[PDB]
Amino acid sequence: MASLIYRQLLTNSYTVDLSDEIQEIGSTKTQNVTINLGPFAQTGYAPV
Amino acid sequence: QNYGINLPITGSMDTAYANSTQEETFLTSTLCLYYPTEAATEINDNSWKDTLSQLFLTKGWPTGSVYFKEYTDIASFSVDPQLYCDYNVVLMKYDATLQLDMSELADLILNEWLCNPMDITLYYYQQTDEANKWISMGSSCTIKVCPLNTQTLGIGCLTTDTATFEEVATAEKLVITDVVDGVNHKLDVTTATCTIRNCKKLGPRENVAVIQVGGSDVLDITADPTTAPQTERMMRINWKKWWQVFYTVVDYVNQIIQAMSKRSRSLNSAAFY
Amino acid sequence: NYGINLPITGSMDTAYANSTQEETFLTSTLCLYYPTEAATEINDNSWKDTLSQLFLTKGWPTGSVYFKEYTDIASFSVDPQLYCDYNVVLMKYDATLQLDMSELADLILNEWLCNPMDITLYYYQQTDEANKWISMGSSCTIKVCPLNTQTLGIGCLTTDTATFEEVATAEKLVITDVVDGVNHKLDVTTATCTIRNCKKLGPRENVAVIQVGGSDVLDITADPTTAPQTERMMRINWKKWWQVFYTVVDYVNQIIQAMSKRSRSLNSAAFYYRI
Amino acid sequence: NYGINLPITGSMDTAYANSTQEETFLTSTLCLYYPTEAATEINDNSWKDTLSQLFLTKGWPTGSVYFKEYTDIASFSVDPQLYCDYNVVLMKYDATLQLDMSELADLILNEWLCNPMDITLYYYQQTDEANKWISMGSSCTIKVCPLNTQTLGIGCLTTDTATFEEVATAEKLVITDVVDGVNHKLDVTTATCTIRNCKKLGPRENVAVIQVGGSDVLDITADPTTAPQTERMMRINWKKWWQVFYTVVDYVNQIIQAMSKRSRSLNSAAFYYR
Amino acid sequence: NYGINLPITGSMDTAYANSTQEETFLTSTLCLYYPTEAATEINDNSWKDTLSQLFLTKGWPTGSVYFKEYTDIASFSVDPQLYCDYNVVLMKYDATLQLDMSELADLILNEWLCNPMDITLYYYQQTDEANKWISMGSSCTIKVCPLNTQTLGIGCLTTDTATFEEVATAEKLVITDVVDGVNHKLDVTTATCTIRNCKKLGPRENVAVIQVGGSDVLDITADPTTAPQTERMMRINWKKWWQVFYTVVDYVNQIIQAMSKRSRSLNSAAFYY
Incomplete structure (x- = not known):
């Protein structure tokens, strides 16, 4: 009894994915927020 | 039962090794790297702390695990000594005129006072x-x-x-x-x-691991003339470039951590100190 | 990692290991914390010294007792790094600062x-x-x-x-x-x-907040249900500051005995961290 | 049977076989590496020759010993074409070049x-x-x-x-x-x-980096945890260069004995390599 | 080694530890030697790369293979320091250079x-x-x-x-x-x-001189009496260079199997004394 129910689950987990994968194509939009982004140096105005 | 020192832990040789040990420290402990300003200045990147951190995942330390503290001199670093993390590995750049400054600082971190x-x-x-x-x-x-x-x-x-x-x-x-x-x-x-x-004085430290850059060393950290103690928490690296030093520290984090561990006062043990 | 996971087999040997105050006189340090006003009222350049000789009477060797000056409950509450083995802190009832005092007590008297x-x-x-x-x-x-x-x-x-x-x-x-x-x-x-x-956790086997003035009802819990009254929470009737100190000296051991500095030490004051 | 398949059984016959140095005197070659400054300080057109006759004393036949001149630790550290059976390299303590020296030691003293x-x-x-x-x-x-x-x-x-x-x-x-x-x-x-x-594989059963000056170091471990000190890593107290060479000659065998046969080159190999 | 003395056992247990190509794919390196003309005819900036992906098919991990350019049989002959575990050298008979080729083969194909x-x-x-x-x-x-x-x-x-x-x-x-x-x-x-x-002596358990062109015969024997034909001496029919390389790739293992690693601990095999 429980034997099934329990095991039955871990048996049908492979599904988790497929489904999981649905709601994405379906949820909102994804966004690539990694635009690299470079750091410092300091150079300036030179005239009298 | 707290301090009553049970007079013995058994001594029976059950002989069962409780495998790994590095897999508890990766999960539960923090690593704090101390370096001098010159070290970071030579690296010249706004993301060096970050890059090294991803590299630290390789050796097995979760993102929020490793911290980077900047001492700018051996004198300042030796004046408020507030070791922040579980494991502290401090990098020292060999300055020959500051040798005793360095000795006095080592004597403080490496030991329990x-x-x-x-x-x-x-x-x-x-x-x-x-x-x-x-x-x-x-x-x-x-x-x-x-x-x-x-x-x-x-x-x-x-x-x-x-x-x-x-x-x-x-x-x-x-x-x-x-x-x-x-x-x-x-x-x-x-x-x-x-x-x-x-x-x-006393208890030593089951943390620091003073890693020495440069010279040739042998280190005489006793006040007397008779003794010279060489501990595992006293390591040395050959200077090339600072990026290399850090790569090595990362590539051998566990080896360095394994040479430290615990810290009498950092466990349940206190009902003592 | 010696500790527990063993059992101390009792047995009522009933042997009595007399005194206990004779080990603390020899091996411990006593740190007295007071407010500026306290010392100002005393007006002597040698009060710390006079009291020290008086402390030999109660059994504390010359280099044993230290005198730390907090000038306010607020600063003392920030910088409370407890210097000695035994710390007995003198607090003067300021009625507007009660919670400031409560928050400070909660920190010294306990463990954190x-x-x-x-x-x-x-x-x-x-x-x-x-x-x-x-x-x-x-x-x-x-x-x-x-x-x-x-x-x-x-x-x-x-x-x-x-x-x-x-x-x-x-x-x-x-x-x-x-x-x-x-x-x-x-x-x-x-x-x-x-x-x-x-x-939170381990109460403190050191501080003995001695309260000057009022009428006191100290509620040091965050809840409403409990009210804990510990031995390390004493009270003295205000007359003059010289009198307060005389009493603290005349009853040093009694005050120390209400603490017991074995669980002390720690390695610095307050906090902790185990970050 | 060559196939570098191994077995050997250690019965204690206890035939402690004698000398060892009398096979090396006959069959091996000794190559001395020094810096230019070393030779310049000696200032003789026949120093290589004089030392060679002195080498007969310690037991090395005339055509046996060779003298190679590196002029810097950086150039010497280059192609590394150790010429003879036994190589003993003399390194003068230059404090700014320490790591240059460490990297060079790491290469000669070890099997790569x-x-x-x-x-x-x-x-x-x-x-x-x-x-x-x-x-x-x-x-x-x-x-x-x-x-x-x-x-x-x-x-x-x-x-x-x-x-x-x-x-x-x-x-x-x-x-x-x-x-x-x-x-x-x-x-x-x-x-x-x-x-x-x-x-990195085996170590070297040849070089014998002899260090002149300092107080000394040169650590060949990349890590922080280990520090290896081998016999093929010797040190001499500087006085004059002529003295250094006299000592190297007066203790050739002692120095050679701390090295010996360059095992990776030994004829007797195969699957292990040469 | 240290061991040769004291014979192996000849018992015919008869088990044959299957494969052998699966150890060489993982642990060995393959170095391809060709002449300039070969690459020039190919005319691509990515030929070395394309062939490398094709080499994964035959089972050689990305960083495994290589490509060394000799521009002539004469230059390739003198400063040949065979770089990798397995070396397969492509030679396109040039009829006036035959002996140049013979002398070069005699050197690579053999142990000196x-x-x-x-x-x-x-x-x-x-x-x-x-x-x-x-x-x-x-x-x-x-x-x-x-x-x-x-x-x-x-x-x-x-x-x-x-x-x-x-x-x-x-x-x-x-x-x-x-x-x-x-x-x-x-x-x-x-x-x-x-x-x-x-x-002279030991042969080479590596090279595999693959000959392009003519009606090729080589005579390692300085004598007149003998003519040795070894497996490490292969021949391919010239069409186009791209075809040659495709074949070398399509039959890498076959070519490697005709050699067999374990014989390569020297940079150059001009053995020195």
Whole structure:
């Protein structure tokens, strides 16, 4: 009894994915927020 | 049951090794890297702390695990010593004129200290054993001493005019002073910029791992002449470039961590210290 | 890692290991904390000295006793690093500062396991009746915003701190308590304040807050249900400060015996961290 | 049976066989490496010759001993074509060149296995505490860029080497070490440098780096945890160069005995390599 | 090793630890040698790359294979320091260069032991069918003068090299053979040449000279009596260079299997003494 129910689950987990994968194509939009982004140096105005 | 030292842990050889040990430290512990400014300046990247952190996942330390503390000098770093993380590995750039500054700082991190405050103003003190030392530190530490015979009278000095005292430290940032054991001394520190405290030594440190860059070393960290102790928490790396130093520290984090571990006072154990 | 996981087999040998005050006289240090006003009223350049000779009577060798001057309950509450084995702190009833005093007592009299908090990057929550947020510094001003299970405000916009709930306005020591098991976006004035996440526990086998004045009813719990009265919480009737000190000296051992400095030491005062 | 298949059974016949030095005197060659300054201080056109006659005393036939002149630790650290059976190299303590010296010691004192690397087409990674990148030449300048599991930079753009991490600026010999198990796009100055992927194996049963001056060191461990001190790592107290050589001669056998047969070259091999 | 003495067991357990190609794919390196003309005809900036992906098919991990460019049989002959575990060298018969090719094959396909020769001071002697003089460099020109048992010339004056016998006129690789057991005063042009005394033997369990072109035969035997044909001496029919490489890739294992690693612990196999 429980034997099934329990095991039955871990048996049908492979599904988790497929489904999981649905709601994405379906949820909102994804966004690539990694635009690299470079750091410092300091150079300036030179005239009298 | 807390302090009652059970007189023994069994001694039966069950012989079962509880495998790994690095897999508990990766999950539960923090690693704090101390370096000098020059180290970071030579690296010249706004993301070096970050890059190294991803590299640290390789060796097995979760993102929020590793911290990077910047001392800019051996003197400053040796003046407020507040080791922040579980495991501290401090990088020292060999400066030959600052050797004793370095020795005094090592002596403090690598060891477990117990201190009390001293009132130089009202009570002339004395050290008791090879483990009672006076550790003073601050802006500018200048200590002059005057040994007392069994009458509260000077010996080579007038307990009245400090111009006759014996100077044993001229403006240091960290100083572990040692006097002939079992003799009282009127002390004259510059308490304005210094703080002097009476410490009893001991327990070593199951954390730091002073990694030394450059020279040739052999390190004499005893106050006496007779002994020379070489511990595992005292490592040395050959200087090339700073990026290389850090790569190695990362590539051998566990090896370095394994040479430390626990820390008497950092466990359940306290009902003690 | 020697400790427990063993049993101390009792047996009533009934052997009595006499005295106990003779080991503490020889091996321990006594640190007296008082307010400036206390010393100012005494008006002598040698009061610390006179009391010290008087301390030999009660059995404390010359270099044994130290005298630390806090000038206010607020500063003392920030900088309380307890220097000696045994610390007995003298507090003068100031009625407007009562909670300042309560928060300071709660810190010395107890034990406190704390970790650093980054108010900037993460939504925190207290776990049990023992998880509290102890913040202290120049000017501590803490505003809070409870989050529902979505990281959304409840009576606030996690975006504008003008909608937050203020729970501390510029204190020098603050032990904040929020509804257990709820995340909160925190807004402290980290410039002048430091806020750390502490877990409580072991009372202190040292401090003996001796209270001068009032009539006192000290409620040092965060809840309403409990009221704990410990031995390390004594009270003296105000007459003159010289009298207070005479009594503290005349009853040093009695006061020390109500502490017992074995669990002390620690390795510095307050906090803890085990970050 | 050559197949480097092994077995041997240690019965204690206890035939302690005699001498050992009388086979090496007859059959082996001794190569002395020194710096120019060493010879210049000696100032004789016949020093190599005088020492050679002196070498007969210690038992080395005339045509046996050779004298090779490196003029710097950087050049000497280059092609490393140790010429003779036994090589004893004299190193004068130059404190600014310590790591140059360390990297050179690490190469002679040890047994190396290398393959060539094409920095242009394939980003590499080191495997164990024994996989190191040994590069050497005119001017070796190595910049590195760690790759995440996507072939993307980590603190760098695999596209612009101005974001790389410099780990060597114009050296003559360099043993580079990176976090094990991570791919890296490499940017060496192949024009003047050559970088090869080496796996550290056996040690050397020859060299005997004899160190002049200091108080001394030269640690060949890349890590922080270990410090190995071998017999093939000796030290002499500086006075004058003539004295150094006299000592090297007066104790040739002692120095040779601390080395011996260069096992990886021994005829008797096969699957192990030569 | 340390072990050869004390024989193996000949018992026919009869088990054959399946494969062997799955150890070589993982642990070995493959180095392809070709001439410039080969690559020039291919005309792609990514040919080395394309072939490499194709090499994964046959089972060689990305960083495994390589490509070394000799531009001539003469240059390739002298500074050949076989770089990888397995070396397969592509040679497209050029009919005027045959012996150049033969001398180069004789060197790669075989195991060589050499010592240095001082043409200046000593008058020497070739011992067996395996003692040969292999000289190579910019321009190798060797003149010889056989000595009778008196150190006197035989058809020559050990004094004037104008009477010597020329046996090599400006070659890039030369394996010279003289009547065994006779001393000879040698006159090489050491300025541009280097001549060394080699003893032959072990073959090479690596190279696999693959010959492009003609109707190819090679004669490693300096003698007339023998002709050895080994597995490490293969031949391919010329169409186009792209085809040659496709075949080399499509049959990498077959080619590797005809060699077999374990014999490669030297940079260059000019064995030095």
